[PDB]
Amino acid sequence: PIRRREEAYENQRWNPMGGFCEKLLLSDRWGWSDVSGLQHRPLDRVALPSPHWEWESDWYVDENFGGEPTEKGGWTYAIDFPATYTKDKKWNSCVRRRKWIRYRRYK
Protein backbone atom coordinates (compact mmCIF):
# COMPACT_ATOMS: atom_id res chain seq x y z
CA PRO A 1 0.00 0.00 0.00
CA ILE A 2 1.40 3.39 -1.07
CA ARG A 3 0.91 5.87 1.78
CA ARG A 4 2.08 9.45 2.42
CA ARG A 5 1.76 11.41 5.68
CA GLU A 6 0.87 15.10 5.58
CA GLU A 7 1.64 17.35 8.55
CA ALA A 8 0.72 20.85 9.67
CA TYR A 9 1.65 22.85 12.79
CA GLU A 10 -0.78 24.86 14.91
CA ASN A 11 1.20 27.80 16.40
CA GLN A 12 0.19 29.90 19.43
CA ARG A 13 1.66 32.75 21.51
CA TRP A 14 0.91 33.74 25.09
CA ASN A 15 -1.06 36.97 25.65
CA PRO A 16 -1.99 38.37 29.09
CA MET A 17 -5.64 38.29 28.02
CA GLY A 18 -5.93 35.15 25.93
CA GLY A 19 -3.33 32.88 27.43
CA PHE A 20 -1.81 30.78 24.65
CA CYS A 21 -3.97 31.78 21.72
CA GLU A 22 -4.22 32.73 18.08
CA LYS A 23 -3.07 36.35 18.44
CA LEU A 24 0.43 36.45 17.05
CA LEU A 25 3.02 39.13 16.41
CA LEU A 26 3.24 40.69 12.98
CA SER A 27 6.77 39.25 12.83
CA ASP A 28 5.57 35.68 13.66
CA ARG A 29 5.02 32.76 11.30
CA TRP A 30 1.53 31.73 10.17
CA GLY A 31 -0.87 30.41 12.80
CA TRP A 32 -1.06 27.29 10.58
CA SER A 33 2.32 26.40 9.05
CA ASP A 34 4.95 23.80 8.26
CA VAL A 35 7.70 23.06 10.78
CA SER A 36 9.77 26.00 9.48
CA GLY A 37 6.88 28.50 9.74
CA LEU A 38 7.52 29.72 6.18
CA GLN A 39 4.71 27.73 4.46
CA HIS A 40 1.02 28.38 5.11
CA ARG A 41 -0.76 25.12 6.01
CA PRO A 42 -4.41 25.60 6.90
CA LEU A 43 -5.74 22.06 7.38
CA ASP A 44 -8.84 22.38 5.17
CA ARG A 45 -6.71 23.50 2.20
CA VAL A 46 -4.15 20.68 2.07
CA ALA A 47 -5.42 18.96 -1.06
CA LEU A 48 -5.08 15.43 -2.32
CA PRO A 49 -2.66 15.37 -5.31
CA SER A 50 -5.31 13.73 -7.52
CA PRO A 51 -8.55 11.71 -7.36
CA HIS A 52 -6.42 8.55 -7.10
CA TRP A 53 -5.68 9.45 -3.48
CA GLU A 54 -8.00 9.28 -0.49
CA TRP A 55 -7.56 10.24 3.15
CA GLU A 56 -7.30 7.46 5.73
CA SER A 57 -8.95 9.56 8.46
CA ASP A 58 -9.49 13.14 9.48
CA TRP A 59 -6.56 15.20 10.78
CA TYR A 60 -5.37 14.26 14.26
CA VAL A 61 -2.68 15.47 16.66
CA ASP A 62 0.63 13.57 16.72
CA GLU A 63 1.14 13.38 20.50
CA ASN A 64 4.81 12.64 20.11
CA PHE A 65 7.92 14.76 20.28
CA GLY A 66 11.56 13.69 20.24
CA GLY A 67 10.90 9.98 20.21
CA GLU A 68 8.61 10.07 23.25
CA PRO A 69 4.95 10.85 23.93
CA THR A 70 3.94 14.44 24.58
CA GLU A 71 1.55 15.52 27.29
CA LYS A 72 -2.13 15.30 26.38
CA GLY A 73 -2.92 17.84 23.66
CA GLY A 74 0.40 17.37 21.87
CA TRP A 75 1.78 20.84 22.68
CA THR A 76 5.46 21.69 22.92
CA TYR A 77 6.72 24.93 24.43
CA ALA A 78 9.47 27.39 23.66
CA ILE A 79 10.73 30.90 24.38
CA ASP A 80 10.10 31.87 20.71
CA PHE A 81 9.11 29.92 17.62
CA PRO A 82 12.69 29.36 16.35
CA ALA A 83 13.99 28.20 19.74
CA THR A 84 14.09 24.80 21.48
CA TYR A 85 10.87 22.97 22.31
CA THR A 86 9.89 20.85 25.32
CA LYS A 87 6.77 18.86 26.16
CA ASP A 88 6.48 20.92 29.36
CA LYS A 89 5.76 24.65 29.71
CA LYS A 90 8.87 26.32 31.14
CA TRP A 91 8.78 29.51 33.21
CA ASN A 92 9.94 31.54 30.18
CA SER A 93 7.86 29.83 27.44
CA CYS A 94 6.02 32.44 25.32
CA VAL A 95 4.91 30.20 22.44
CA ARG A 96 3.71 26.67 21.81
CA ARG A 97 2.85 24.51 18.81
CA ARG A 98 1.49 21.06 18.03
CA LYS A 99 1.74 18.86 14.97
CA TRP A 100 -1.37 17.70 13.15
CA ILE A 101 -1.05 14.68 10.83
CA ARG A 102 -3.09 12.88 8.19
CA TYR A 103 -2.32 9.91 5.94
CA ARG A 104 -3.39 9.58 2.30
CA ARG A 105 -3.40 6.30 0.40
CA TYR A 106 -3.10 5.62 -3.34
CA LYS A 107 -5.70 3.51 -5.15
Author numbering: 64 to 170
Which sentences from the paper describe this structure?
However, upon reductive methylation of primary amino groups, confirmed by matrix‐assisted laser desorption/ionisation (MALDI) time‐of‐flight (TOF) and in‐source decay (ISD) mass spectrometry, the N‐terminal DysF domain of TECPR1 yielded diffracting crystals, the structure of which was solved to 1.9 Å resolution by molecular replacement with the NMR structure of the inner DysF domain of myoferlin. The N‐terminal DysF domain of TECPR1 represents an elongated finger‐shaped domain, which, overall, bore high similarity to the inner DysF domains of myoferlin and dysferlin (Patel et al, 2008; Sula et al, 2014a). Mutations of W77, L88, L89, I142, K152, K153 and W154 into alanine all abrogated recruitment, while mutations of I65, M80, E134, K135, T147, T149, K150, Y169 had little or no effect. Subsequent mutations of nearby residues R76, S90 and D143 into alanine and C84 and C157 into serine also abolished recruitment. Notably, W77 and W154 are solvent‐exposed and upon binding may become inserted into target membranes.
Here, we identify TECPR1 (tectonin beta‐propeller repeat containing 1) as a receptor for cytosolically exposed sphingomyelin, which recruits ATG5 into an E3 ligase complex that mediates lipid conjugation of LC3 independently of ATG16L1. TECPR1 is comprised of a central ATG5‐interacting region (AIR) and an adjacent pleckstrin homology (PH) domain with affinity for PI(3)P and/or PI(4)P (Chen et al, 2012; Wetzel et al, 2020). Inserted between the first and second blades of each propellor lie DysF domains, named after their occurrence in the protein Dysferlin and so far without known functions.
